[PDB]
Design a binder for this molecule. Structure first.
Ligand code: HEM
Ligand code: HEM
Ligand code: HEM
Ligand code: HEM
Lengths: 309, 308, 308, 308, 308, 309
């Protein structure tokens, strides 16, 4: 899917950039934002064409509140702000954001350059509220030391899971994406043995093999994020998580970013993680990870994004 | 297609693992085997996701007999055990195999790791009967020194040639695969001149150009493996041949592996090779290569495989 | 795509070869040529399969006069010879060509070797009339110093821009290609400031960013090559331009090659460049670039090419 | 070199990490720090060996005050704290730093992971006072758009420029390094024409060609940073500058890091830049760049570091 | 060092071939062997030059006994057959070998081809006794899942550790190499917890960090293989260990290969491993790994090798 | 040897550029040429630094006649114009050239860009008389289809063979290089069988193995270019040959370029090839290859090159 905005199905990359911005309250601000995001193919190619491989991609997401400013009476079926959750000890806050740019490439300079051009074009019309420079960490691992992304659906399965279909024809090809910037307590996580960490996750650490059923805890990250409806049909999401961090401020992080054709799936996963199934049987990754943001965005298909205003 | 099992249409790779196994007669065995293969996506991703490029692939083949132990009520139009051939000079054996794992990656370690995890999860339920570690040799050559795989169908031609279509709709997306582990007589091949070797194969050696029509022997490997029907229509297979060997055992091999939507095509090629066309006019490649195995498998589509 | 002839939508490559040829007068010449181009998949795979990555591609174009010698039976709707243009300052000549081979690969040797096999196979039946060895120059730049190709359509847009569809169903999958070999006056170009060069092209030089609507001159290259119909729909072409040159001859060039499902789009860009829009307001790029060739070809789909 | 600490002469990399730290007051803090830096080869290999290519490097610098806490016994001839400069328009501050870790690799994860291990191992004994994640920007450019590093000495010239020799034999193989973290005023920079920017730097922008002697302004960055002794001998430094920034903070930076066997060379460049040569005639780069840090370190050879 | 035999100091590679041969008792044999190895540069270049990067290398080892058949009047200070070890629980055999070919490249095909040409040129004059195809496993790990080779000496440390110096001047540039083909008990190793495995090795598993001094078992592989003399001086070897295996035979191996300027260092390591220090306190790696071979060779400098 | 002019010992590359120029007769011309070549490190780094790998190299050679214009009374011991040879059917002509630029890199654009900058700086002061764009052809082969360069010395052996030592201390580190642009008769060469081609060369075609002694013809390319003096000491040269060609003008070529500390070795090789040993027993490669140029150049060390004028 070379140099085309809204390519949700892109495979993992060595570098990413996650930018979340809040749009200004004016009509000028709205119009500038609308010009930039609807012409996003411009800077995408301005930057990406310079690398022969064409690895650069950019997915634009729009928040529920800003969507209603730019497209009042045409609205994807499930667009709403992020639903915050409050467990006894761990919570998923809902944090501001009208615009998401999820940028991936084989190199840092390409992500940075595109972000620079996007930010420059928006000028005073929007403000960056969250910025994360993701990087691949060894053999596709996160900073907890586990391979992160293994069971992502691919090919047809990825399209089926991520992309709006016949349920909502006016927005076919779009998606819904949720982000959360997690920070880890590395000290506390290191007090665990490998075997305990594997029980927390649901897979072996080095070898990345799923624990067998008889050894798989009911509150493992894997068990809690396995979604099968009443009819026995599995429901998956597409994740593009990346490590990030700052050694001086002791930030070791995982940027969660998951796409679904219906955010009810992602939301159910989150509520299973934070609230438990059975109730109180929550995801122990959360003992070692604290979400600092939580925002949902609608990802319009190319055709819809280009029509805005 | 990234990290999806039963991806028959994958381009050539630097490394291969060909694993042929036989299943236990037991019923725990039938079940374990069934669990490992119907969930093969699991180990594929467990290993393959660790490589940024996601080059790892795995095609699972099921022998006719073991297919009957596991899906009795439904069977693909052309599933049967490998038809042995007994020709004038040369013979193709029919050797045992219930399960085929055709593994490819950019790296050896990925092939080995995936194999290791497949074998470990099968435990005592099945036994490795043939293991081949294939490798790319220079510019896509076999150990006979010819570029090997040149005329393979690609893209749409490849799908049409290898993948079960409207003609057997319950098994669309599947394929039939035949393997044969060939061992070469390197001394004997080396006593031929380049030009004689070219006559045997059907193409120039260094340049990999197909001989002119007037200079093309009627028993050249290329002529014998060219299939045209009565309407004038060509029928092709998709080969993923790799070299392999052991210097201490003086083994120098080409691992043959061919996919077709209908094994009749591959079987006819084998027939023209081993029996000759006209009869006795056989493939001289056979004078320097001996098939140590010979096994046919059904390659179920990913949907069919995941039900079991 | 992989090693398939007529792959119009291939992404940019490190190297390419542009070969333009005129065919001989005899019916023999016309048969040899038809034989070569209709079997072009042979040499394509013979060379291309030798590279693991399979980057080698080859698009064959056929000029209008030659097409009539071979298929007076049926014609693509827009096939005609290249139309010369005579502007107030610059002219685009129409120069001979019956056949185009547009060859791309990750490596020069692959392009060269494919060209070698093609030319050898054609022998006396054809003569090379123009030959250009294109190369990538830094971060996708032309020798004028500007990123060249930025706004090419990609993916579905590329197919909708370049590939013949419902409008001419007999030749669906084909395309039309125009080539022009441009030589630059480098010393003249360098007398301009970067800002002046930016106003000539329509984008900033290092950063490759389109000039704002109100800083875009009406005769900028970008402005003149923007084609918008009465219904507000933009019409794009697919360009595969490469740098070339010779330091001893002081030749510094850009080889233009542009594919479109309807060549009138490309032709209209050419007219607006050479004659200006409004008339007189011509493309200042032409003050530093002189086209030495100008030829139109029909690019038959694989099916149509293989039946010629 | 391969996975050896204090490899000053490594070529440029895709990624780097600049960590500046202040050590604690206690003798315990001074012992932990000495333990970590003297054993720095451990973490270097622990991380670095994991990459086949072995690109990971780590140069440890020690500030003058900290060096006295650890080796009041003997001092390198030119070790002193960074000298602040107060020019007519711009100033270079002297900011704290006892330790520098200058880490380079082909990959960000390697730099990050080495930094992680270093910081963890130091625990409470030290505090990170400045941290910069450098990255390569297109074809070796800084964020000002100019190729940055062109005239670095290489090979023998690099060793003669950067490495302590006969002049201070007790510390042979060591070096002296100055870091300054510069932030740019990008909107101001963009108001200049390319030609104006070229006159500020001393080279053409896209093509990276030194301006002719008679078009080179006397206050160009290149002119001011050319150091020629009375005997006509040029004295060069070794720079490993990288881009960095944060789009949300509008931070666009160049991290300066310059190695020399005698830091007076580097210091003299700094004085000529900030104060001008002649006085008043200062470097116009400083009109668009503000140094937020300024620190001098001694870079001990492996031997000396390993005995600390 | 490119395409030069006896390049002991080469960095790790993606692929290896370890070939151990015994020579014929005959005198034609002595001579043929002598011709093949003294001219080993020939085949090395014949194969290696075909790869642009020139990654192929070949170290030739000569057993003590065969060295006496071929260079009677001159012998290196420490050449002798491999000293077998018979410990409390575990034993290291002394297996036969006259010739060692330690081959490394970026690719398998280059290793195999070189091996093929070496074996072919030796003909009946010598017989392959052990053949191992080594491969890189993930991020420089052995099949026990630990990063393997981390603490290897590099650059000058590596030359000082592995290469014969002023202390045996007739053989400067040479080395002594010991091989041992280890096979692992994967089931048994898998019943240990990660933490127990870490205690056995001496380093953390995923992170490859060396255990703290207070947590470092006295029988950990690292402790046992740490050699410090009476003056306080450490002595190291250069290891080029690779993984290898066969899934059907359930073989999972680490091929040990260690180079030293003096085999006493390596022999002491082996002694501390197998016998323990204090006695009985042996290396628990040995509880999960069994040495199937054990052979010592002299690695002549390229000058010494080419005279024979 | 990163981005340093006169790096004679560089390993093979994917692309090369061979430029031969004749200097103008004036004093201005001489001075401009002298400025350009003595400052050659300038454009070398201006171009080469832009590629992270630093693969770009440039070796400057100076002809005997031009050397005497720029360095009248300091002269390397063996600098003379190319010695032409005249066999009964094949000849090695001596053709003009005062300057050689032998440029190598991993990419074409880098070779071309450096050549452009060099040519631009020389302006009217010199004229290109020969220009060849070399490329790697498959697995290090020439257009005859044989691996070409196999037995080149490497490392210490390469330094010993190519570079002036104690014999001529004032020019230590310099070298002497000879070029000849060969064109092949591809038709005639294809009428030979592989086995005959192997006898012409002295090695097997595909596998690149030296023919054994008992099968190695006395007029094979290998035999004729094997140089052993009376004392039994072998003398080698360092070659950087590359393919080149033009399909339209039916040019299929090999650019010969060989470096030696003493051109007597290269010259002896050439006379063995063209004249035979025994006499008339000439190199049969020459039945299929015709030299269109022949020029010798002195390659000054960096220090000597930078001192010129
Ligand atoms: C601290 C943040 C997180 C970390 C470190 C983390 C880590 C992991 C790891 C190591 C795996 C196993 C390999 C795989 O990707 O298949 C995994 C699986 C998964 N995680 Fe997360 N995760 C995080 C947050 C989340 C969140 C917030 C969600 C849901 C909204 C989520 C959903 C999933 C899903 C759906 C899977 C695949 C489960 C399966 O079907 O096997 N993760 N995660
Ligand atoms: C010792 C084992 C074999 C070797 C060494 C070998 C080698 C080759 C070579 C060098 C080529 C020409 C390049 C190419 O187009 O791929 C070729 C072509 C081919 N081979 Fe084989 N082959 C072997 C076994 C087989 C077998 C057992 C079959 C059939 C079951 C087969 C079917 C084909 C086909 C269909 C072609 C393409 C023919 C065309 O249309 O030109 N091969 N083989
Ligand atoms: C089954 C065979 C072996 C395995 C799996 C193995 C594994 C390892 C591992 C995982 C390490 C730590 C990483 C490193 O520094 O390389 C190591 C270190 C080392 N091994 Fe082995 N090893 C084996 C056999 C041997 C033998 C036979 C010797 C001696 C003859 C040896 C000598 C060493 C040495 C000297 C070190 C570095 C110690 C230090 O200074 O930290 N190893 N080995
Ligand atoms: C048409 C031009 C030429 C072609 C096609 C050619 C080709 C070859 C080939 C294929 C080889 C074998 C592999 C190797 O490089 O070691 C070779 C070797 C060699 N050639 Fe050439 N060559 C040409 C011109 C020359 C000239 C003019 C000279 C001497 C001035 C020369 C000197 C050598 C040398 C010294 C060797 C290595 C011989 C040895 O010690 O084994 N070549 N050449």
């Amino acid at each position: 899917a070379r140099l085309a905005p809204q390519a949700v199905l892109t495979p993992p990359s060595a570098a990413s950039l996650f930018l979340v911005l809040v749009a200004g309250d004016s009509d000028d601000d709205r119009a500038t934002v609308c010009d930039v995001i609807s012409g996003i193919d411009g800077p995408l190619k301005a930057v990406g064409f310079r690398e022969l491989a064409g690895s650069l991609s950019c997915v634009v997401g729009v928040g529920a509140q800003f969507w209603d400013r730019v497209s009042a009476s045409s609205k994807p079926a499930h667009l709403h702000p992020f639903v915050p959750l409050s467990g006894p000890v761990h919570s998923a806050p809902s944090t501001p954001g009208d615009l998401l740019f999820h940028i991936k490439a084989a190199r840092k300079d390409l992500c940075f350059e595109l972000g620079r051009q996007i930010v420059s074009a928006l000028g005073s019309a929007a403000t960056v509220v969250d910025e994360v420079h993701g990087f691949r960490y060894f053999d596709s691992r996160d900073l907890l030391g586990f391979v992160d992304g293994t069971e992502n659906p691919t090919d047809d399965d990825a399209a089926d899971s991520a992309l709006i279909g016949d349920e909502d024809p006016d927005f076919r090809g779009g998606s819904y994406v949720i982000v959360q910037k997690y920070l880890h307590d590395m000290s506390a996580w290191n007090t665990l043995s490998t075997e305990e960490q594997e029980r927390v996750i649901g897979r072996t650490k080095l070898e990345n093999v799923e624990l067998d059923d008889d050894a798989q805890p009911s509150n493992s990250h894997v068990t809690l994020n396995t979604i099968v409806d009443d009819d026995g049909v599995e429901h998956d999401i597409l994740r593009d998580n990346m490590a990030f961090g700052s050694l001086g401020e002791a930030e070791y992080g995982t940027y969660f970013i998951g796409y679904a054709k219906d955010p009810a799936v992602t939301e159910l996963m989150l509520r299973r993680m934070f609230l438990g199934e059975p109730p109180g049987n929550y995801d122990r990754v959360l003992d070692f990870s604290t979400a600092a943001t939580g925002t949902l965005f609608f990802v319009p298909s190319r055709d819809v994004l280009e029509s805005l205003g």
